[PDB]
Amino acid sequence: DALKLCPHEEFLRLCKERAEEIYPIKERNNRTRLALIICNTEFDHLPPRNGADFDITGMKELLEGLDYSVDVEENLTARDMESALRAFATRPEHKSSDSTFLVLMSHGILEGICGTVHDEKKPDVLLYDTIFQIFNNRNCLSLKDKPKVIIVQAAVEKDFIAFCSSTPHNVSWRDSTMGSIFITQLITCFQKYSWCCHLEEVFRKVQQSFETPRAKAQMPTIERLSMTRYFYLFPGN
Numbered sequence: 001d002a003l004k005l006c007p008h009e010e011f012l013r014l015c016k017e018r019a020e021e022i023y024p025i026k027e028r029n030n031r032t033r034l035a036l037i038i039c040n041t042e043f044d045h046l047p048p049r050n051g052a053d054f055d056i057t058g059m060k061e062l063l064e065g066l067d068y069s070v071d072v073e074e075n076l077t078a079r080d081m082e083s084a085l086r087a088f089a090t091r092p093e094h095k096s097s098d099s100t101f102l103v104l105m106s107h108g109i110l111e112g113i114c115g116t117v118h119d120e121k122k123p124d125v126l127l128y129d130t131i132f133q134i135f136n137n138r139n140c141l142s143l144k145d146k147p148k149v150i151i152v153q154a155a156v157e158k159d160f161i162a163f164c165s166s167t168p169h170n171v172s173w174r175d176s177t178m179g180s181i182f183i184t185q186l187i188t189c190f191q192k193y194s195w196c197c198h199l200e201e202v203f204r205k206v207q208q209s210f211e212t213p214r215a216k217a218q219m220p221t222i223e224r225l226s227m228t229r230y231f232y233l234f235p236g237n
Contacts, residue, residue: 020229037073037103040107099148099149100146108152111125145228158227160224199232
């Protein structure tokens with residue numbers, strides 16, 4: 001399985017004929033798009049999430065195939081995750097970028113994602129709203145009017161989209177324990193459909209795979225959709 005590339009002519013054709021419907025794409029040269037992967041595997045009061053190492057390498061290989069430079073932050077606290085996100089939102093390469101990806105994977109609760117020192121009595125949680133506050137058009141200007149794809153896995157803001165999986169830790173991993181079900185299905189659909197589908201359409205393909213009578217409960221959800229146009233990643237261009 002590999003990331004199928006979109007033909008150059010279709011990338012040029014779709015850019016001309018559907019320019020007003022799709023997000024703009026910067027040229028390969030002079031392009032410095034960035035991506036950030038935050039993943040907590042070791043905890044003090046939570047079960048170990050070892051096996052997400054394959055989700056890190058999988059997402060990192062996929063984003064690199066999408067011409068993204070991936071920064072990996074691992075086993076951080078709630079405050080350290082806050083500081084890493086704002087440092088990412090202020091990097092100058094976003095000015096020469098067209099989009100960004102934020103992949104956050106750890107244990108979680110409804111209001112946010114847990115950190116390495118989370119306890120049910122002393123919670124250490126990064127709230128989901130903090131992520132949008134950091135990258136909104138007010139506090140992040142180099143990514144204004146640009147797609148800000150957020151992919152979360154747990155247990156005015158514009159141009160946002162969030163693919164969220166809250167599958168509990170017991171039933172969230174593949175039978176091999178070599179990666180999670182959600183990430184593996186996400187990578188598979190990106191490798192098979194990035195070249196002919198826009199981003200939100202790819203997220204729907206991932207959801208359709210969870211449309212079995214057994215997997216419907218673990219179905220990922222698209223939340224806080226603030227995007228104003230379609231995002232074709234045009235893999236290979």
